[PDB]
Amino acid sequence: MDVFLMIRRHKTTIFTDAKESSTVFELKRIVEGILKRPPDEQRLYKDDQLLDDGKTLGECGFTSQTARPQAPATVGLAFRADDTFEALCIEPFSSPPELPDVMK
Amino acid sequence: PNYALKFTLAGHTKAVSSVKFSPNGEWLASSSADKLIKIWGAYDGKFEKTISGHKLGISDVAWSSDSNLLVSASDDKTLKIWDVSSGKCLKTLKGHSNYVFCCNFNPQSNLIVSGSFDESVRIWDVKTGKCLKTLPAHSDPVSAVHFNRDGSLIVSSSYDGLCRIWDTASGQCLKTLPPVSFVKFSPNGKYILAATLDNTLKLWDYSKGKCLKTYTGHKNEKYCIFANFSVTGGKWIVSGSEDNLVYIWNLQTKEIVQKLQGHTDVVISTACHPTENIIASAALENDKTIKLWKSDC
Amino acid sequence: VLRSVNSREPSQVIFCNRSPRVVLPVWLNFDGEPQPYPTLPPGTGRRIHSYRGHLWLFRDAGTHDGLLVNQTELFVPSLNVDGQPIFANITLPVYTLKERCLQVVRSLVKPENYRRLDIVRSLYEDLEDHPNVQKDLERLTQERIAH
Amino acid sequence: MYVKLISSDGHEFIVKREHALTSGTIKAMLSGTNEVNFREIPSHVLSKVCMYFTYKVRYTNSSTEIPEFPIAPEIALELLMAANFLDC
Structure with a gap:
């Protein structure tokens, strides 16, 4: 069972896949491939909850049923830079317009 | 001949399957896909009555020798017998496992024979309704079943492309002579007239077993079209045609001697009046009508 | 054929x-x-x-x-x-996104009203080109003549 | 190999290359930095478009129950427009 993720920090959003059986750590090394920051500089979250590096994605609640290609699960990302820690901050997407009269 | 249109009967609301003249020359019966049998005056084309019962559309009608009874053959798997005076279903003849396509009383008119999509030929008792014999006739649908002059034989035709003669008495296949869309015995007794779906009619001496005549020029590839002998005046072969015409051949010389125009769909049934030079003809969904044609010979 | x-x-x-x-x-x-x-x-x-x-x-x-x-x-x-x-x-097939977006709008909008959407005339005609088997049967006959 | 797709409101979207080359419009913008700037398509739409790309690649030639691609009413029109432009 594969999982499908958006990794989101500030105004960047990564689309990538993993296994339920992957660890948070091995997903920090995927993010290292992309964003070129080591796993000691990353903290990944789900909602508010800091995810531990030894639990699988599955154990963190990320299942084939809740992390689909057409509806991926959101993973928050905040970095450390030496003695400086940023708090998770995700800029929300734009809203659409109010739906038009003929679509009601 | 000079057959010209005289009457047009437009009663059925769906395609017309079969038209038969009564042996007493008095009546024309029509069966239709609209589930109804309708009786017509043969001479003045007058609406006599509607007969209802079948739960699906009807495929063939046949008169008894005494003109008092009809057999119908239906998609609803039933053959039913009717008193023609009343409109009243005397019997229902269950036995076939699929659509029943053809039917005919024996000359004695105490038997009925029928053919079905179930690939079988059945023989029935008119008094009781007991199916007597079920012949394992073909390996494909039966298109026509007819009794001979003294009612001792049966001819059948099928989509296996074979035509076959049965000894009524036992049920043995006496003889076996593209699909065969239609088959029947000549009045004079000796011959058999058979249509194939290669646009062809053929006359056979069933005893000797060779083909003596071939009638072409009409269109016959999909539908099972009913063909006839007319012999009141001259001797003709009559047939419907998918090109919407009624064809007439000099029986002996094979020449087309007339084509009757009027029908606006496949003409699927022709009938030749018993004592007089009259033809009935019936067409399908775009037409839905019966036409009567009266000639000088 | x-x-x-x-x-x-x-x-x-x-x-x-x-x-x-x-x-x-x-x-x-x-x-x-x-x-x-x-x-x-x-x-x-x-x-x-x-x-x-x-x-x-x-x-x-x-x-x-x-x-x-x-x-x-x-x-x-x-x-x-x-x-x-x-x-x-x-x-299901994998519809193109466009095709799917048409499906959704078609089902939200009465066709006597497609043209009160503020979109290019192009999309009106894409909207109105409702799917039918005969169009597909035609298209599929022809690919078999290439194949 | 990943590519950056920047929306009209600033949001950057980092998707596999193969995924983005679903669009011929995108394949062209990459050739004429491996980023791509949309000047009208905003984040809620471009994010959906990206979801489409991952739906497409996965379920194409799967032989499984392909699920439906869901599209909220509120986003259908813009996404239609975008898809039309990206041709995907």
Whole structure:
């Protein structure tokens, strides 16, 4: 069972896949491939909850049923830079317009 | 001949399957896909009555020798017998496992024979309704079943492309002579007239077993079209045609001697009046009508 | 050319609706014309009587969106072997995003009103070009002439 | 190999290359930095478009129950427009 993720920090959003059986750590090394920051500089979250590096994605609640290609699960990302820690901050997407009269 | 249109009967609301003249020359019966049998005056084309019962559309009608009874053959798997005076279903003849396509009383008119999509030929008792014999006739649908002059034989035709003669008495296949869309015995007794779906009619001496005549020029590839002998005046072969015409051949010389125009769909049934030079003809969904044609010979 | 042949050779088939659409099975008769059959609700299946050499395709019975069957457009029963029915697995295709976006808008908007959407005339005509089997049957006849 | 797709409101979207080359419009913008700037398509739409790309690649030639691609009413029109422009 594969999982499908958006990794989101500030105004960047990564689309990538993993296994339920992957660890948070091995997903920090995927993010290292992309964003070129080591796993000691990353903290990944789900909602508010800091995810531990030894639990699988599955154990963190990320299942084939809740992390689909057409509806991926959101993973928050905040970095450390030496003695400086940023708090998770995700800029929300734009809203659409109010739906038009003929679509009601 | 000079057959010209005289009457047009437009009663059925769906395609017309079969038209038969009564042996007493008095009546024309029509069966239709609209589930109804309708009786017509043969001479003045007058609406006599509607007969209802079948739960699906009807495929063939046949008169008894005494003109008092009809057999119908239906998609609803039933053959039913009717008193023609009343409109009243005397019997229902269950036995076939699929659509029943053809039917005919024996000359004695105490038997009925029928053919079905179930690939079988059945023989029935008119008094009781007991199916007597079920012949394992073909390996494909039966298109026509007819009794001979003294009612001792049966001819059948099928989509296996074979035509076959049965000894009524036992049920043995006496003889076996593209699909065969239609088959029947000549009045004079000796011959058999058979249509194939290669646009062809053929006359056979069933005893000797060779083909003596071939009638072409009409269109016959999909539908099972009913063909006839007319012999009141001259001797003709009559047939419907998918090109919407009624064809007439000099029986002996094979020449087309007339084509009757009027029908606006496949003409699927022709009938030749018993004592007089009259033809009935019936067409399908775009037409839905019966036409009567009266000639000088 | 794209039509059922009248083999008269029976074949037991399982119409298996593995889509979220209400499916309409559609038999191509002997002259190539499409005949509607009874609808299958989603996540249902049905043993049904057909014949060898016959042709089927399947659609959303409500909008006539096309569906796949055993990974392809057309289904053709063969002879049952060893007493085994044949499975027609009705599947969704991967619609293009555009095609899907049209499906959704079509179902939200009465066609007497497509043109009160503020979008290019191009999209109006894409909207109005409702799916139908005959257009597809035509398209599919022609790819087989390249193939 | 990943590519950056920047929306009209600033949001950057980092998707596999193969995924983004679903669009011919995108394949062209990459050739004429491996980023791509949309000047009208905003984040809620471009994020959906990206979801489409991952739906497409996965379920194409799967042989499984392909699920429906869901589209909220509120986003259908813009997404139609975008898809039309990206041709995907």
